[PDB]
Every structure is written in structure tokens, then in C-alpha cells.
Symmetry: none
Subunit: 96 residues, 6 copies
């Protein structure tokens, strides 16, 4: 499980039917401190995260489960939006 920032959005009209009508968001991995890994990816989204918001990503077979079921053709899925990250009385990230 990893933290990531939603950097944007991808649009595929012709797509695999098992993606339903869920958003495909451009996500860029970060350290929990907030350090871009350069690592880019596209994550399916059914929670409803917007760009700039920090998200919690699950990959692999859990990414399938998290999206819907084992049938899902996904290897990367957003399972949470971050409200804040604290570090002993200090809020290093907060959602606005």
C-alpha cells in the first residue's frame, strides 16, 4: 500500500467492459513525507478523488478486489482519500 497524488485524468472511450464507467486517474507516487517518486501510474477510481488530492493506492490482486472483484482487469486502485498526515503533533499534509 502506497501514498500517491492525483496529478490528472485519462480518458478511454473504447475500453475493456469490466472497467464499467469508473474514472481512470493519473497518479504520481509519493513518500509519506510528500516526496515524488517520479513513479507514474494510472489508477482506477470509484471513491471519487479529484486532482491534487492525496490518495491511498492498492495494487495487484487486492486492486482487483478493491475495485469490485477478482474479475476486474486492474492492477492499481484508489481505496482512500487522505484528510491529513500527522507526525507527532505536526500536520505535514492537510486537505483543502
Amino acid at each position: 500500500m502506497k501514498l500517491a497524488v492525483v496529478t490528472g485524468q485519462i480518458v478511454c472511450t473504447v475500453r475493456h467492459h469490466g472497467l464499467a464507467h469508473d474514472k481512470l486517474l493519473m497518479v504520481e507516487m509519493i513518500d509519506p513525507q510528500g516526496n515524488p517518486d517520479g513513479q507514474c501510474a494510472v489508477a482506477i477510481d470509484n471513491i471519487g478523488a479529484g486532482t491534487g488530492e492525496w490518495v491511498l493506492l492498492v495494487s495487484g490482486s487486492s486492486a482487483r478486489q478493491a475495485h469490485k472483484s477478482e474479475t476486474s482487469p486492474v492492477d492499481l486502485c484508489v481505496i482512500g482519500i487522505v484528510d491529513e498526515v500527522v507526525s507527532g503533533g505536526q500536520v505535514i499534509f492537510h486537505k483543502l
Copy 2:
């Protein structure tokens, strides 16, 4: 998933039955700034992507599910053709140039 550009194709007349008669695309990955990275591979495709087009790729067991089932001998599968990619408040790719 990952973004790649269909750079070409592979033709295997003699092939594993679980590949069906689906297409075998040469794909090169794409980076945040919208550019072809170093990384390359071959991905199966029944959606019908063509060379030059950008595609969304799934890998590992998910690719097997995507293509057919765990019977499928694939580690990479195309799950969509990309119409446009908007990142950082800027359109970094669009079909219609």
C-alpha cells in the same frame, strides 16, 4: 495500470492456443511529461489498438484476467485506447493531435 504507445507489432503464426487470434503489439511506456520512456514490451490486444495510438496497459495476473482468465499465458494486456491524457492542468496527449 500504465500508459504506452503502440510502436509496432509481432506476428506469430505458430502460437499458444490461449493467445487466441488476438493481436500482439509492441508497446513502449510513457512518462509523466507525456514522452516515450526507455521501457518496452509486447502486449496482447483484442480491443484493436493501432500503431501510433496510446493505450492503457495492465500487467501480471490482472492481465490474465483482462484477456480471458488465469488460463491465458500473458503478463501484459491492453485495456483501453487513450483518447486524451490531462495532467497538471494541461492536455499532454490527444488523439486528434
Copy 3:
């Protein structure tokens, strides 16, 4: 498995229902000598570890707390105690 110190907490009220009734921790890994080793990470936590506590982590999403560490002894010497 790996040792780590809980450096903080990640809050997610809006969350996947499968992840429900779990805590999300910010953790920093501990090197062979009992020192925090820079590389920070995110771990799932259903035991209930607070910041400052040491935790045992299994790698298999990925990081999960599988215990809170009362003490650690190395080559004869205690390198950590609650």
C-alpha cells in the same frame, strides 16, 4: 519481517469499506543496530500502535503491523526496551 518505529498517522475518513476498522500508520524502518534508517513508509495497522512505539512488519497490500515490540536484544545487548 522488519522492525519500524511509528512516526505518525495518516487519516482517511473517506475510505474503501474493505479497509474499514483499520488504522493507517506512518512508519520509519529500523536498521540492524536499532536506529531509524531514513526510509519511511505506510503500514496498515489493526493491532493499535501509537506514535513512538516500535512495531513488527510483514511484507505482503504491502506493510502490515503484526505486533508491538516490548524489547529487542541483539548480540548479547538490548538495543530497545519499551
Copy 4:
């Protein structure tokens, strides 16, 4: 999946009976530009590829398995391999 050239054969008469009726190949991976890329490997083969032939390899009974023999490869407009 990955492209590779069959560089040779590994012979094992004494073998696990589950592995029976398969061929063991020595393969070298092929980079984006159609050149052998140094990193050699071992692949299982139940199709039947000889040395010199190019093969398609899936990564996933152990790791590398030949899932086809390559008749030709075209990249950015240009044919980089033909049988």
C-alpha cells in the same frame, strides 16, 4: 511479454515427471531495437523452437515460457526482424 532469441538448449534426461514432454531453452532477451541485450536466461518450451529462432516469452511451471515463435517484428514503420 518479452522477445528473445534461442541461443541454445539445456539437456536434462533425469527430470521431474511434471516437467516431462517439455524442452529447456537457453535464451537471450531482445531490446526495443531488435538487438540481443546481453542478459541471458532459461525458458521452458512446449511449442518447439530451435536455436536462432526468435520467441515470445511470458513471465509467469516457474518463470519464462515460450508462447510463440516470431515470424516477424515491425516497429516504428520499419521491420526489425523477419524469419
Copy 5:
């Protein structure tokens, strides 16, 4: 599998139920020449290894199977205590040395 030296131990009174009451050893891996390499870890143990002793370690899903089943939350498990290691026609470790 891998050879390691039990260098110490970890005590977790509050712990996941699927760890049972098994021991939690600090293990450092060993290299071909018979020496403690850099790599270290914590491994579960119901065989009963003691500090100083060399042990055979299994990792990943195999470790879960080794310890109990896929219910076990472990990525490392001891599967034996090493009496001796003979390599290159030379005894490179023995209990009684």
C-alpha cells in the same frame, strides 16, 4: 532457502493471533564463504533455535505454509537448525566448533 545466524530476539507481548506463541528471532543471513553478510531480518520460529545457532530460512508464501498456512502473517520462517555446512569440499560450519 537461505542460511542465517540467530543474532538475537524480539519480544512482542501484544501481537497478531496468527503468530501463536512462537519465537521471533533476529536473523542475519550468511554468504558462500560461511560469514554473516549485511542483510538482516526477523523470522518466526517454532522449531526452537537459540541465539548463535545457524538456521535454514524460508521466505514468502512458503514461509506462511511452513509456519501454519496462508492465514499466517509472516514473510520469513525457520525450517531447521543447521548441524553443519559442507561447501567446496570443506566444512565451513559445525555446531561443535
Copy 6:
């Protein structure tokens, strides 16, 4: 799947009961191509390979299957002994 050379033997009297009475061999992975390298490991063996002989190793869940079943507590198993390796028709390794 990887090539390896059996460099020696390990002896564990007190051992996991799911190892039966099978040999535990010191194995050193073979570089590309012809000689060994740093990578060391211990592989379970039920084929019966001796020291110096080149072996075919399977790891992970297949290593479990190859040894006996999913029950097996092994992450590395020898599934073949090499008779020979031929490059471009040039026997680079042959068994004595």
C-alpha cells in the same frame, strides 16, 4: 527457472517435519554464461544430485509443488540435473 551448481550440502537433524528426509543442497546460481556467481541458496532435492553437478532450480510456489505439494515448506527446489548445455552447436557444459 534458473541454472545452478551444487556447491555442497547442509545437515539439519532438527528440522521441519514437512521436509521428510530429503537432502538440503548448497547451490550457487550460474552466471550468464558458463560460470557461477555470488548468489547462494539452499535447495531441497529429491532427484538425487551430487556436488559439482549442474541443476535446474524452481522457486516459489512451484518449488512447493515440485517438492511434493502446496504444503511443502520450501521456496527453492531442484527439478532436474543437467546432462549438457549446447550454445551454437558448441557444447559449453557436459556432465562427467
